[PDB]
């Protein structure tokens, strides 16, 4: 009885295994534009991904990831709200089954069509698994996707899911740019929160984008054709992988623009 995201293995049920699912600091949340505070004092944001290393693409049953080479010097986010220098290890997606729902934060109670994380460590930690228990060891890049014109730098990711569409699958997926996934401003929103599935350790600086990126309606219908089942289990589309919001408490959301 493994978690997930129906109705018997949920988010509502994530508490039990993972007690942390209810505590001061849990993503996602609604980002209340409002009420977030520009911070005038937030350095800008570096995403620096020209030497990025991708390796393979998986299915682990709750979302496809890549993961990225990171054994060297490449990589990396930095400024913004982080201290020191983060290196990228993976990204991976949520999404919905329509259109109108699939993001994990929300923005003004808005949801998106999907939400892309993109997930660094803290270099000061040596690894991912020692970042990973700190409560600055991770950031995540958090940015949204809306139905529109395709991204053409998604595509390579979108004509590769067939050949992991089940639990388990996996591929080799080299020399894959990230950059192409980026939308034009890094105008963001920042605040403490923690890993959006189990074990939901508190140990994330979120950096939510504010300009989503437009994908096309086929690249997302290729996403909703993963199984969260394995090869030869009763098909379960991989579908409405997303956690909703969780209580703010008493955090508060910088914004790097006014
Ligand atoms: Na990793
Ligand atoms: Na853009
Ligand atoms: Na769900
Ligand atoms: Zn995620």
């Known amino acids: 009885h493994h978690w997930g995201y129906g109705k018997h293995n949920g988010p509502e049920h994530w508490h039990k295994d993972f007690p942390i699912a209810k505590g001061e600091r849990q993503s996602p949340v609604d980002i209340d534009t409002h009420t977030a505070k520009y911070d005038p004092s937030l350095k800008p944001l570096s995403v620096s991904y ?25 990589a990396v986010l930095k400024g913004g709200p982080l201290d020191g220098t983060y290196r990228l290890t993976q ?26 994380h993109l997930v660094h460590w803290n270099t000061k930690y040596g690894d991912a698994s020692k970042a990973s228990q700190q409560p600055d060891g991770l950031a995540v890049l958090g940015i949204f996707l809306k139905v529109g014109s395709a991204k053409p730098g998604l595509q390579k990711v979108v004509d590769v899911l067939d050949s992991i569409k089940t639990k388990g699958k996996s591929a080799d997926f080299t020399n894959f740019d990230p950059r192409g996934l980026l939308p034009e401003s890094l105008d963001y929103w920042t605040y403490p929160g923690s890993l959006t599935t189990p074990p939901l350790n508190e140990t994330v600086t979120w950096i939510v984008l504010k300009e989503p990126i437009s994908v096309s309606s086929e690249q997302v219908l290729k996403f909703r054709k993963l199984n969260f089942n394995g090869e030869g289990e009763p098909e379960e589309l991989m579908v409405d992988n997303w956690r909703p919001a969780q209580p703010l408490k008493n955090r508060q959301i910088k914004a790097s623009f006014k």
Do not use: C
């Open 91 to 116: 990204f991976h997606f949520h999404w919905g089954s329509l259109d109108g729902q699939g993001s994990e934060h929300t923005v003004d109670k808005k949801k998106y069509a999907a939400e892309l």
């Open 50 to 74: 020209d030497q990025a290393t991708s390796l393979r693409i998986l299915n682990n049953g709750h979302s496809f990831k890549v993961n990225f080479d990171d054994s060297q010097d490449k």
